[PDB]
Amino acid sequence: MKRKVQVKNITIGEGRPKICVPIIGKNKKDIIKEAKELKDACLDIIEWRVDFFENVENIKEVKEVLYELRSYIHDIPLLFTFRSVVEGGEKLISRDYYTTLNKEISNTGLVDLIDVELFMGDEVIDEVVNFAHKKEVKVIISNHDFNKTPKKEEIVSRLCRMQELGADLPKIAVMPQNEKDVLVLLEATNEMFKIYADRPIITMSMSGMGVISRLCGEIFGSALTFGAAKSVSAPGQISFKELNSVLNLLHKSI
Amino acid sequence: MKRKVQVKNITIGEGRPKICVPIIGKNKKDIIKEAKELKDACLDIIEWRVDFFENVENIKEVKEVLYELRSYIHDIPLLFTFRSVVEGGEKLISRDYYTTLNKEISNTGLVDLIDVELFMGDEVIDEVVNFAHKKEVKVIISNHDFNKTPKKEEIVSRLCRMQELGADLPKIAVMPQNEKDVLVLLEATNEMFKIYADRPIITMSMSGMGVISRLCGEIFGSALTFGAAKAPGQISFKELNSVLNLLHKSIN
Ligand SMILES: *Cc1oc(C(=O)O)cc(=O)c1O
Ligand SMILES: *Cc1oc(C(=O)O)cc(=O)c1O
């Protein structure tokens, strides 16, 4: 069977996919303003994309925001994510600081999950994952491809590697070059879900063409889907309110 | 550059998929009541599933419903469909009457489209298609598999055959036995759409597992999607419409 991943009072891997919405504010004021817009909406998890925070290199200022943020969102599960430049992020930092940041923040007891990138390598991952687990923090190990959709077996191989590395929630995001690529991502998702996964997984096909992948998790297997805070697309994004409506519509269809 | 299909003021094959809702009333009063709920609603096309009509074997009573129905939906495109028993319908009728019914209703000038089944055979199809076209009525040629999802290539072969038989709108509905079957239906749809189609097509994967196929037609290539008026595997048409516009705006 499979393990479920409990964060706060939310059970990832059970029922309807959970909706996660990111906070991308550049400063403390904007982050809190974003948080207040999300604290009482129908969403499941809030992600703090800390790589947008201008003072991310100062651990003390990062902690200060985290304290305040925690106080406003109460018991909503919080995912901490520093997305590196190579995988779409906003700020260059060292490998050593990436490790320190994630460890120090996991140590606060204020974050429920952290996102660590597969591409950082086994040394970094082993250190950050083991420490997060010591602090009862759940781990998403993520990988992105912004130019293509790897073959089904490649996608499955990466998700399996993420399980082997101790990810509580393997995550993969790929870019379709055509409509068939969106279907490959969905095919890989379900094969993993059905045959290889012993825990919940997170997958998406990016761009406008890949949006179906954000809607059909309950059927194909993605356990978490990401909505945008605002009601304006990138495009390829869906505002979280509208995403909630679609997920409920599909949950009730069966 | 690909042909669109124009019915009244609705352009099928352009922009978001068009929403079609069936009326399944067993009698005239019930059919009218249903039409009254759909007339000022957010949908594009109304389908009359005439096989549910108890007096379907009386062409004069079928026409009577049609004249009354048109006083309520004068400008909404109307699709006329007698779904046969072999393809999930309610009423057994002869092959001759199936042909007669579709011809006399096409001749009234009061329906914008009719739906005839591919597996009725070329003789029946050729006669009905030819006559419908002389009256400027659009024809959906449909095919259903309630037990399984044929292989991608067989789905494409059927959609191609429908085009060869003069369908204005090829239509296929298949039943998934697993999640991959839903992807097979979507893959066949886009393959047909991009490589072999010279007109709009309509496709769907049935049941709760295939519901996603009713929502993503703009990306994959289905030009019409069917909502329910009031059942697992069906989506109320009211919701269907917000979703389609939401997805139309999210395109690159
Ligand atoms: C988590 C996650 O989500 C998206 C998205 O577009 O919603 C993209 C992405 O790269 C990522 O890591
Ligand atoms: C047109 C059409 O729609 C459905 C549906 O489930 O909406 C099924 C079906 O057999 C058909 O012909």
From Swiss-Prot, chain A:
UniProt keyword annotations, A-Z: Amino-acid biosynthesis, Aromatic amino acid biosynthesis, Lyase, Schiff base
Pathway in which the depicted protein is active: Metabolic intermediate biosynthesis; chorismate biosynthesis; chorismate from D-erythrose 4-phosphate and phosphoenolpyruvate: step 3/7
Documented EC number(s): 4.2.1.10
Catalyzed reaction equations: 3-dehydroquinate = 3-dehydroshikimate + H2O
GO term, biological process aspect, one: 3,4-dihydroxybenzoate biosynthetic process
Binding site for 3-dehydroquinate: 47-49, 83, 214, 233, 237
Family in the record: Belongs to the type-I 3-dehydroquinase family.
Subunit structure: Homodimer or homotetramer.
Name of the protein described by the UniProt record: 3-dehydroquinate dehydratase
Organism of provenance: Clostridioides difficile (strain 630) (Peptoclostridium difficile)
Lineage: Bacteria, Bacillati, Bacillota, Clostridia, Peptostreptococcales
